[PDB]
């Protein structure tokens, strides 16, 4: 059983590149992070910052989550991110994604001791 913290890292962290370089980034990454194993995950954001920077957001700007809870945090600064969204003609198992590189604020939900990101809520 993956902890929620570990699942967040697998789904959302990519501290190995500064930005997506190509339009096939999402196809590549959704596969290898095994986000297309049983179904195509429809929407997923990758963050190109250090783990430490992303974890730090749990100490930044407290905001409501989409779901009404109040354990969400917005990053003070923008971060390099890539937005992956399944195309309309994507069919499992040949999952296909639009890649959008951006510099936006992230919003995450934080939980636990240590108090660390467990959900990606949105980018701004």
UniProtKB/Swiss-Prot annotation:
GO terms for molecular function: lyase activity; nucleic acid binding; ribonuclease A activity; RNA nuclease activity. Disulfide bonds join 26-84, 40-95, 58-110, 65-72. Glycans are attached at residues 1, 7, 34, 37, 41. Changing residue 12 to A: Loss of activity. Interacts with and forms tight 1:1 complexes with RNH1. Dimerization of two such complexes may occur. Interaction with RNH1 inhibits this protein. Monomer. GO terms for biological process: defense response to Gram-positive bacterium. This is Ribonuclease pancreatic. The gene is RNASE1. The active site is at residues 12, 119. It is found in: Secreted. Endonuclease that catalyzes the cleavage of RNA on the 3' side of pyrimidine nucleotides. Acts on single-stranded and double-stranded RNA. GO terms for cellular component: extracellular region. Substrate binds at residues 7, 10, 41-45, 66, 85. The chain holds residues 27 to 150 of 150 of the full protein. It is an enzyme of class 4 (lyase). Its EC number is 4.6.1.18. It catalyses: an [RNA] containing cytidine + H2O = an [RNA]-3'-cytidine-3'-phosphate + a 5'-hydroxy-ribonucleotide-3'-[RNA]; an [RNA] containing uridine + H2O = an [RNA]-3'-uridine-3'-phosphate + a 5'-hydroxy-ribonucleotide-3'-[RNA]. Belongs to the pancreatic ribonuclease family.
């Amino acid at each position: 059983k993956e902890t929620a913290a570990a699942k967040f890292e697998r789904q959302h962290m990519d501290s190995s590149t500064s930005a997506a370089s190509s339009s096939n980034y999402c196809n590549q990454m959704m596969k290898s992070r095994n986000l297309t194993k049983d179904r195509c995950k429809p929407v997923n954001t990758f963050v190109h910052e250090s783990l430490a920077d992303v974890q730090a957001v749990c100490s930044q700007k407290n905001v409501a989550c989409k779901n009404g809870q109040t354990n969400c945090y917005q990053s003070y600064s923008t971060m390099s991110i890539t937005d992956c969204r399944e195309t309309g003609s994507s069919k499992y198992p040949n999952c296909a994604y639009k890649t959008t590189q951006a510099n936006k604020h992230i919003i995450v939900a934080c939980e636990g001791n240590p108090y660390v990101p467990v959900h990606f809520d949105a980018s701004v």
